[PDB]
Design a binder for these strands. Structure first.
Ligand SMILES: [K+]
Length: 122
DNA sequence: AGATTGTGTATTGAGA
DNA sequence: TCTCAATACACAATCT
């Protein structure tokens, strides 16, 4: 059967950039997946909408990109879940922090910062 | 026990 | 035309 697929009018930043920004601006520079999902939802009204598949995309990003590093909730449970996630900025591909040229940014360029690197790198 | 997490697999389509 | 971030679903294993 044909696979379902749709592109959504998501914010014009990569999921990587948005995740990295919420982690880096958290008090301990670490967040669980549950906490990341909550904080991402604060960034833009799109994430308060009824499309929820971005939550899966965020999970995907944490595993897929090497810049996201799991920190064990319990050091004696290396197979435990609900761990913290950190960002290693030296592993981030810099261009993935730039504002994306999508229909969403073209609709109103001036409400979107051109680069999130200033809010990620110290 | 279903919800959640972490990762594997795979397809998609707009920017470049 | 082509890349890869976006998106979708499987599945094992933990979590509550
Ligand atoms: K990772």
């Amino acid at each position: 059967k044909k696979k379902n697929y749709q592109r959504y009018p998501k914010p014009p930043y990569s999921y990587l950039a948005m995740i990295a920004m919420v982690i880096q601006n958290s008090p301990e520079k670490k967040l669980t997946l549950s906490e990341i999902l909550k904080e991402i939802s604060t960034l833009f009204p799109f994430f308060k909408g009824n499309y929820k598949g971005w939550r899966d995309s965020v999970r995907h990003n944490l595993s897929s990109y090497d810049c996201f590093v799991k920190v064990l909730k319990d050091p004696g449970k290396p197979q435990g879940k609900g761990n913290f996630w950190t960002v290693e900025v030296n592993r981030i591909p810099l261009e993935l922090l730039k504002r994306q040229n999508t229909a969403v940014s073209r609709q109103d360029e001036t409400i979107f910062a051109q680069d999130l690197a200033p809010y990620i790198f110290q």
